[PDB]
């Protein structure tokens, strides 16, 4: 039973992001994708039970997938795509993890922002990984190995 996990996700994620910096002609998006905003002070938030807090994340997360598919959606068999691919796979494991935990699938929700920038999704992932994730599964937090 691992916490190998979040620690491992993060970096696996960042590795993805890096590999993008150098694909062929890399450019924005036709259509804005919505990814889960970059909330900033987790005040009101870490006061609240470990359950709602989890839902939000599974909430955001499912949205994150949607954004990301939304973005694979958009383009052809290209290198970002093929990566948004491997990313989306990644995002997927959390999704499990959190579905696993609350033992239901919630629908996408919580405040997002529109991003043409294909990084701002790689980003968005890591932001919950570093924030709302870590900040969850510290404090007791029966999270998912």
């Amino acid at each position: 039973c691992d916490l190998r996990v979040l620690s491992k996700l993060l970096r696996d994620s960042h590795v993805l992001h890096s590999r993008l910096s150098q694909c062929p002609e890399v450019h924005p998006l036709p259509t804005p994708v919505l990814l889960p905003a970059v909330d900033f002070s987790l005040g009101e938030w870490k006061t609240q039970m470990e359950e709602t807090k989890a839902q939000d994340i599974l909430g955001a997360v499912t949205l994150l997938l949607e954004g990301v598919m939304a973005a694979r959606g958009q383009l052809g068999p290209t290198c970002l795509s093929s990566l948004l691919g491997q990313l989306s796979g990644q995002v997927r494991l959390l999704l499990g993890a959190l579905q696993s935990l609350l033992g239901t699938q919630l629908p996408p929700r919580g405040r997002t922002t529109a991003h043409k920038d294909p990084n701002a999704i790689f980003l968005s992932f890591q932001h919950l990984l570093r924030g709302k994730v870590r900040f969850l599964m510290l404090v007791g937090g029966s999270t998912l190995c």
Epitope: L65, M69, R92, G96, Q99, L102, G103, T104, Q105, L106
Partner: antibody, heavy 116, light 107 residues
């Protein structure tokens, strides 16, 4: 955009078998946990089985009433969930909804009647 | 195998009047979930997580409850709202619904 058409519904004489099919489109099917949820006017609204994504490794779950007789299965690969009703029963009768995310989308149901 | 018992079995409400429905869990749960259903039709997810309207739902529906007695409120009743409202508890397995509650509009 997200579309569930169950099919397969029928007259079954008691003791008889039936398979319900439920075909999804509109979404990442592979990603969704699925449920069969069945409705009658006497019984009413009573959940039937649940069947988790590959991510949560297809973990299966039935109502005690149905434990041992119905067999839920999917093919993530055909974007469809199934109910292989078995050893049926005049109560097993009613509208069978194949269902969404954790209950978030909902096909229109087949009528299914076991009866002599 | 928690038992959800939705308060009024059928009620009637006047256009623009306050509708308030109860559901009540045989044993404390994290969250209620509500679906609206309408004769002829599949049911649809109306609120989830005790109080988030599912995309689709008018902002007149206020989702509420906590622990063991929960409740769905229509601010000022419309005629679309006439339908049954089923609560469901995803507390464990089996999932579990309720009676239902037939709202009727009263023209």
């Amino acid at each position: 955009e997200v579309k569930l058409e169950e099919s397969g519904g029928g007259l079954v004489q008691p003791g008889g078998s039936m398979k319900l099919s439920c075909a999804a489109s509109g979404f990442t099917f592979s990603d969704a946990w699925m449920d069969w949820v069945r409705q009658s006017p006497e019984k009413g609204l009573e959940w039937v089985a649940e069947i988790r994504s590959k991510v949560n490794n297809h973990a299966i779950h039935y109502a005690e009433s149905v434990k041992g007789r119905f067999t839920v299965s999917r093919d993530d690969s055909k974007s469809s969930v199934y109910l292989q009703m078995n050893s049926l029963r005049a109560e097993d009768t009613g509208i069978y909804y194949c269902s969404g995310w954790s209950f978030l989308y909902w096909g229109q149901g087949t009528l299914v009647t076991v009866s002599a | 195998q928690v038992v959800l018992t939705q308060s009024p079995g059928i009620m009637s409400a006047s256009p623009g009047e306050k509708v308030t429905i109860t559901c009540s869990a045989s044993s404390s749960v994290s969250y209620m979930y509500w679906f609206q259903q309408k004769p002829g039709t599949s049911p649809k997810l109306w609120i989830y997580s005790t109080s988030n309207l599912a995309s689709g739902v008018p902002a007149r529906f206020r989702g509420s409850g906590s622990g063991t007695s929960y409740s769905l409120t229509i601010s000022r009743m419309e005629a679309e709202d006439a339908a049954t409202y089923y609560c469901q508890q995803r507390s464990g397995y089996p999932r579990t619904f309720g009676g239902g509650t037939k709202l009727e509009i009263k023209r």
